[PDB]
Design a protein around this nucleic acid. Structure first.
Ligand SMILES: [Mg+2]
Ligand SMILES: [Mg+2]
Ligand SMILES: [Mg+2]
Ligand SMILES: [Mg+2]
Ligand SMILES: [Mg+2]
Ligand SMILES: [Mg+2]
Ligand SMILES: [Mg+2]
Ligand SMILES: [Mg+2]
Ligand SMILES: [Mg+2]
Ligand SMILES: [Mg+2]
Ligand SMILES: [Mg+2]
Ligand SMILES: [Mg+2]
Ligand SMILES: [Mg+2]
Ligand SMILES: [Mg+2]
Ligand SMILES: [Mg+2]
Ligand SMILES: [Mg+2]
Ligand SMILES: [Mg+2]
Ligand SMILES: [Mg+2]
Ligand SMILES: [Mg+2]
Ligand SMILES: [Mg+2]
Ligand SMILES: [Mg+2]
Ligand SMILES: [Mg+2]
Ligand SMILES: [Mg+2]
Ligand SMILES: [Mg+2]
Ligand SMILES: [Mg+2]
Ligand SMILES: [Mg+2]
Ligand SMILES: [Mg+2]
Ligand SMILES: [Mg+2]
Ligand SMILES: [Mg+2]
Ligand SMILES: [Mg+2]
Ligand SMILES: [Mg+2]
Ligand SMILES: [Mg+2]
Ligand SMILES: [Mg+2]
Ligand SMILES: [Mg+2]
Ligand SMILES: [Mg+2]
Ligand SMILES: [Mg+2]
Ligand SMILES: [Mg+2]
Ligand SMILES: [Mg+2]
Ligand SMILES: [Mg+2]
Ligand SMILES: [Mg+2]
Ligand SMILES: [Mg+2]
Ligand SMILES: [Mg+2]
Ligand SMILES: [Mg+2]
Ligand SMILES: [Mg+2]
Ligand SMILES: [Mg+2]
Ligand SMILES: [Mg+2]
Ligand SMILES: [Mg+2]
Ligand SMILES: [Mg+2]
Ligand SMILES: [Mg+2]
Ligand SMILES: [Mg+2]
Ligand SMILES: [Mg+2]
Ligand SMILES: [Mg+2]
Ligand SMILES: [Mg+2]
Ligand SMILES: [Mg+2]
Ligand SMILES: [Mg+2]
Ligand SMILES: [Mg+2]
Ligand SMILES: [Mg+2]
Ligand SMILES: [Mg+2]
Ligand SMILES: [Mg+2]
Ligand SMILES: [Mg+2]
Ligand SMILES: [Mg+2]
Ligand SMILES: [Mg+2]
Ligand SMILES: [Mg+2]
Ligand SMILES: [Mg+2]
Ligand SMILES: [Mg+2]
Ligand SMILES: [Mg+2]
Ligand SMILES: [Mg+2]
Ligand SMILES: [Mg+2]
Ligand SMILES: [Mg+2]
Ligand SMILES: [Mg+2]
Ligand SMILES: [Mg+2]
Ligand SMILES: [Mg+2]
Ligand SMILES: [Mg+2]
Ligand SMILES: [Mg+2]
Ligand SMILES: [Mg+2]
Ligand SMILES: [Mg+2]
Ligand SMILES: [Mg+2]
Ligand SMILES: [Mg+2]
Ligand SMILES: [Mg+2]
Lengths: 48, 116, 120, 221
RNA sequence: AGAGAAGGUCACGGCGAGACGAGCCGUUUAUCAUUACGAUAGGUGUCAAGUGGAAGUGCAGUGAUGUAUGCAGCUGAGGCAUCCUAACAGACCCACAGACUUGAAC
RNA sequence: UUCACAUCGACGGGAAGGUUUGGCACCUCGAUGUCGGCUCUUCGCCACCUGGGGCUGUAGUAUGUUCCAAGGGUUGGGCUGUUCGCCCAUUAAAGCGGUACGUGAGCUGGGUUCAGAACGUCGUGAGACAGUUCGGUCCAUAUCCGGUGUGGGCGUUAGAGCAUUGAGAGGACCUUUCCCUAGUACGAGAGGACCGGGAAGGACGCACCUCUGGUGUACCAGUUAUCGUGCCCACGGUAAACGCUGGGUAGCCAAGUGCGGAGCGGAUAACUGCUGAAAGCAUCUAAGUAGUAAGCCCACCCCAAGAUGAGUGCUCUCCUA
RNA sequence: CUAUAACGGUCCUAAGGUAGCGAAAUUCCUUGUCGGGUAAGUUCCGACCCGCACGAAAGGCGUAACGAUCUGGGCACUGUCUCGGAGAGAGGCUCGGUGAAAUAGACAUGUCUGUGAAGAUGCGGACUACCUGCACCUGGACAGAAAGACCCUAUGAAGCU
RNA sequence: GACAACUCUCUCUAAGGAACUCGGCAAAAUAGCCCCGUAACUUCGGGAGAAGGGGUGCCCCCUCACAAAGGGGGUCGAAGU
RNA sequence: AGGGUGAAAAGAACCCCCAUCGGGGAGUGAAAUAGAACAUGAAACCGUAAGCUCUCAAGCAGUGGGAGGGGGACCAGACC
């Protein structure tokens, strides 16, 4: 198919922020992984 | 849907699954510790415990199976020599998996696997 | 499990060798049929010098099917061929003699065929 | 909806056969029962505007429950339980909390019963399996084999009709099988035998209540 | 501001749930027993089940081959036992008694 | 048979409908892609079958004509590029039409509208024919609306975990034959019932894998050729994505196994009525009221308080200074 | 006996179609008609002849063999089909990295029924509808793509006779 | 990595076997070697591998192996180019 | 197709980040916010921050009315 008209400026941004919003959930996992690793008590994750 | 299907596909056909897992056991049993993905490590527990189960009943019929499975010849002869003294009391669970950061190229979740 | 264009054998002394079902009778707008169901059939091979010609349209009932017939007591019947027996409007066969075994389920509709059979 | 009587909940265990004395075979389905079948709450028209009664099932460890759910069960002095379902009725004059519900007292023999549970989840299936659509030709140059085809007329109406039979998720929802005959009771093993099939695999929850008929049991409208 | 309410999310182990999300189960595995709750997955053990009589050895035969040890051997996506390995480490969001009016109570 | 109106109805007349062939040439020529078929819908009634009635030149069975009624259903094949139409065997009946003669950014391309070639015919000829014949490239990653499903966010007036009412919405309420009543009613006899009841099926739908089997590249076994494990024995790899075959658990699946379609519930249409005025009679009604349709509404099955009209109930939490 | 016309008469031409074939690669009427084949045959084979409009080197009638030729029937075979189902592989889907394209008046872009250059998300009225994503299907946007290749116009162009 | 629909490239598919379809399109089936046996028609060359049937592995012997083929006997499998 | 540092390369010693590239100070210069991909540096386009503001809507997006809130060297019954 082909688009009839072009997407506007703000409708574009709303779709980009959703793609960027995935970084919010990836950062929480990293912070949870660091604090769960700076204690030297986890025997299931070897970081070296 | 895969209801009732317990099998690790690893994105490979059967000829490559039967060779890939068969080849990693050759390296683990001689090195004792390797670095692989988590999907490959999870599928590895079924086969490593099988070969170790053959050593407990270290007969001649049980040895020929390992020779057909294990590629190299010297490890199988060396495997039956040490396992009865090393695992003369354990019943299953002959290995553990330690997680690890992923790779740089493809973000594949990596993890170590070793023999207890 | 008799679909049209299905080549059936002949069990009776009617003087025919092969049939070809074209329609089903009794089952409204059904296409398959089991033992005991009436069918319309077309002769394709006949015996020379007999009342039945080669290209007649007739009525017949299925007596043997390669598809399996289930019973209530868990028993199941299976044959190694598909066959039938011609009939009249009343349901009596034209042939005097019958070949092959017949199931006991036909007594409620076709008792004459059960009597003439060698076994059951 | 309004139920004809009071039911209980059990778990599917499997399926087997049942030979009668004369010799007839009966494909029978087996349903077990966990520990808890006790009443938890009694509703009335003065409070809720309708008459019904809750029933719990599948006792479990207390730590697993959320603390709000504990206080709901601890009011009637009731053990911890996982599931909860109601049974709407016309009159609830003979029910109280902390009351057990034995099925043999409610379903003796040969009684019709309405089974209801969750079906097997098929996932995002197409039209041929979900809506039993027909298939296109597999030869003679046809490009469309398992596709839908047309999804509308054209300029008139100019849009796709609402509720058009299209792909989507299949199964995994609630259903009800009506008028199933009970074959046998066994109080020794705490198990019940019902003719016919039952929605779901073994281990699935279900509710079985007396068979409701339009003009006989329930109030017509 | 501090600290983390109930509870939710991530994470860890999985699914008869599932495109991804979601949904469901579980996260140190109990002790007492007339009794039902604390085995998630894998492994191990055992059983059903499937295939249909392994290897080695002996016997018979010039030999192919047959035959005994032997419901064998292999498999066991399933059922039941068993904490043997992994559910470790833990992280984030979150707690103004619920504005203002009127009436009836008090 | 006599009797215009049971059923036909000349001669002529008055209408609606917009599916036929046409008239006009208003939109589209910097493109609105065609005939038929496949798949998938959805509406209309001027009703082919199924439900309920009236009249009959309706004895009965079976029709005929017509009213209410569009809920559901309306087969598979032979010939044809076809539509149309004929034929075979069946069926309760095998309805007519609209949606760009529904649907090609969904399919097919047999037909028609390209280039080749040929017959007949016309033409001095090149060539030509709404004449025939053989052959002949159908592109496309969905932006938006719309549609099938599934999430997140926020709101619902403190914040939550469960259980729920059902405004609204959808799905499904279909249908054949046989037996009993009864060879009774009816009828000279042939022949053969209404109503009511009970069985066996069809199609469709919701589920299931105990059963019978398909698949089953987890697995077991047999076997051909070749390479390798030092060699024999025994095994492994390859012969795409099983080398070729014989079987196969769970799972999935139907051909297999169960269930389903109920109501002496409500209100009506057509029709039959009761009581009874205007009109001392009569009248089903311009007061009132009763029977009664596969139709309408509820009931049955599923969803459902984003129902901003955001509900209801039980329980829990709101610490420190 | 009808029905046909071996035969004859007349008009006009340079002469009026002889063998053989014939609803044919030719037949408008046409699915001609009879027969065969099929349960049923607008196709196929045989025959009749009313040859619209066969015909003798733009050759006529036959012809063994040959044909990636056209055409009809039959045996075997089978998922073509009744009627679908299961499985493998590559994509699709998720994560990480790299990263286009046609297209595009601006777009805050619902349905119905009307209205209108006669076929409206954009005008009128009513109904419906929280905001925003993902995966799937394409009815519409008279979607995209090529200043229509059909038809007509130009005192346009070109090839051929 | 995961193992939805749908598309493509492949395998099998119960009972039936062209009912599909403009049309057996596509797919399936046939297949090698040695024997037996091969029609109408014909330009006498062909048709013809016509069609259609039987056998096929391994071991021992006959046998002297005569490079073969053939014969006899035995044996495994559902199935021997 | 591709022109413009500066009057003069005085083209940035040295220190930190530092494997490079590149950047921050220092120093040079009237100017480094002229630092080499460097002169004045408009618009489309991609953004950060601040003030008001949308999740029961519907609309060629504005216009006439203008609730509530906000803002500033002039003033303020004004203006944005
Ligand atoms: Mg890949
Ligand atoms: Mg291979
Ligand atoms: Mg005939
Ligand atoms: Mg599922
Ligand atoms: Mg079909
Ligand atoms: Mg295809
Ligand atoms: Mg529109
Ligand atoms: Mg907390
Ligand atoms: Mg979650
Ligand atoms: Mg376990
Ligand atoms: Mg066994
Ligand atoms: Mg042995
Ligand atoms: Mg066994
Ligand atoms: Mg086990
Ligand atoms: Mg224990
Ligand atoms: Mg019109
Ligand atoms: Mg017209
Ligand atoms: Mg245009
Ligand atoms: Mg009408
Ligand atoms: Mg038209
Ligand atoms: Mg059309
Ligand atoms: Mg279209
Ligand atoms: Mg064509
Ligand atoms: Mg000429
Ligand atoms: Mg062709
Ligand atoms: Mg296309
Ligand atoms: Mg989109
Ligand atoms: Mg959408
Ligand atoms: Mg309601
Ligand atoms: Mg409804
Ligand atoms: Mg089964
Ligand atoms: Mg099973
Ligand atoms: Mg199976
Ligand atoms: Mg070697
Ligand atoms: Mg091998
Ligand atoms: Mg080999
Ligand atoms: Mg190799
Ligand atoms: Mg390969
Ligand atoms: Mg292959
Ligand atoms: Mg099989
Ligand atoms: Mg197989
Ligand atoms: Mg009266
Ligand atoms: Mg009166
Ligand atoms: Mg009245
Ligand atoms: Mg009714
Ligand atoms: Mg002549
Ligand atoms: Mg003809
Ligand atoms: Mg001609
Ligand atoms: Mg044909
Ligand atoms: Mg002819
Ligand atoms: Mg000629
Ligand atoms: Mg001449
Ligand atoms: Mg000539
Ligand atoms: Mg010639
Ligand atoms: Mg050729
Ligand atoms: Mg697949
Ligand atoms: Mg794949
Ligand atoms: Mg990516
Ligand atoms: Mg909008
Ligand atoms: Mg108008
Ligand atoms: Mg309009
Ligand atoms: Mg407007
Ligand atoms: Mg409008
Ligand atoms: Mg598509
Ligand atoms: Mg266009
Ligand atoms: Mg033009
Ligand atoms: Mg032009
Ligand atoms: Mg002019
Ligand atoms: Mg088959
Ligand atoms: Mg057809
Ligand atoms: Mg056909
Ligand atoms: Mg072919
Ligand atoms: Mg082939
Ligand atoms: Mg031959
Ligand atoms: Mg020949
Ligand atoms: Mg500057
Ligand atoms: Mg500049
Ligand atoms: Mg509203
Ligand atoms: Mg609002």
């Amino acid at each position: 198919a082909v688009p009839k008209k072009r997407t506007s400026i703000y409708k574009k941004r709303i779709r980009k922020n959703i793609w960027k919003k995935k970084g919010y959930w990836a950062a929480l996992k990293a912070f949870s992984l660091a604090k769960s690793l700076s204690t030297g008590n986890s025997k299931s994750f070897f970081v070296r | 849907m895969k209801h009732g299907r317990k099998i690790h596909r690893l994105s490979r056909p059967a000829d490559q699954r039967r060779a890939l897992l068969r080849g990693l056991t050759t390296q683990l049993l001689k090195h004792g510790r390797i670095k692989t993905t988590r999907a490959k490590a999870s599928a590895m527990r079924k086969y490593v415990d099988k070969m170790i189960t053959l050593a407990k009943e270290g007969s001649l019929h049980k040895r020929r199976q390992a020779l057909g499975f294990i590629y190299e010849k010297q490890i199988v002869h060396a495997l039956f020599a040490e396992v009865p003294e090393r695992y003369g009391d354990r019943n299953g669970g002959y290995t553990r998996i330690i997680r690890t950061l992923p790779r740089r190229g493809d973000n594949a979740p990596m993890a170590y696997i070793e023999l207890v | 499990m008799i679909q049209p264009q299905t080549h059936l054998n002949v069990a009776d002394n009617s003087g025919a060798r092969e049939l070809m079902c074209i329609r089903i009778i009794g089952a409204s707008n059904r296409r398959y049929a089991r033992i005991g169901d009436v069918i319309v059939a077309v002769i394709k091979e006949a015996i020379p010098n007999t009342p039945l010609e080669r290209s007649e349209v007739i009525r017949a009932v299925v007596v043997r099917t390669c598809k399996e017939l289930k019973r209530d007591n868990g028993m199941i019947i299976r044959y190694d061929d598909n066959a039938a027996v011609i009939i009249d409007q009343e349901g009596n066969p034209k042939g005097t003699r019958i070949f092959g075994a017949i199931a006991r389920e036909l007594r409620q509709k076709f008792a004459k065929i059960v009597s003439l059979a060698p076994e059951v | 909806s309004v139920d004809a009587g009071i039911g209980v909940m059990g778990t599917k265990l499997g399926m087997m056969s049942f030979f009668e004395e004369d010799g007839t075979v009966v494909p029978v389905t087996v349903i077990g029962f966990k520990e808890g079948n006790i009443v938890t709450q009694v509703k009335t028209e003065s409070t809720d505007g309708y008459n019904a009664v809750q029933v719990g099932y599948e006792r479990l460890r207390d730590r697993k429950l959320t603390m709000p759910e504990r206080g709901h069960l601890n009011k009637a002095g009731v053990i911890p339980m996982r599931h909860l379902q109601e049974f709407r009725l016309v009159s609830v004059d003979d029910f109280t909390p902390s009351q057990k519900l034995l099925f043999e007292e409610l379903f003796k023999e040969g009684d019709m019963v309405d089974i209801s549970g969750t079906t097997i989840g098929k996932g995002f299936q197409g039209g041929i399996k979900r809506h039993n659509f027909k298939r296109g030709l597999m030869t003679h140059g046809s490009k469309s084999h398992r596709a839908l085809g047309s999804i509308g007329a054209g300029t008139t109406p100019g849009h796709v009709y609402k509720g058009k039979k299209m792909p989507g998720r299949m199964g995994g929802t609630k259903t009800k099988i009506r008028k199933l005959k009970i074959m046998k009771i066994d109080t020794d093993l705490r198990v019940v035998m019902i003719k016919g099939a039952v929605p779901g695999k073994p281990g699935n929850l279900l509710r079985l209540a007396p068979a409701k008929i339009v003009g006989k049991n329930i109030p017509k409208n």
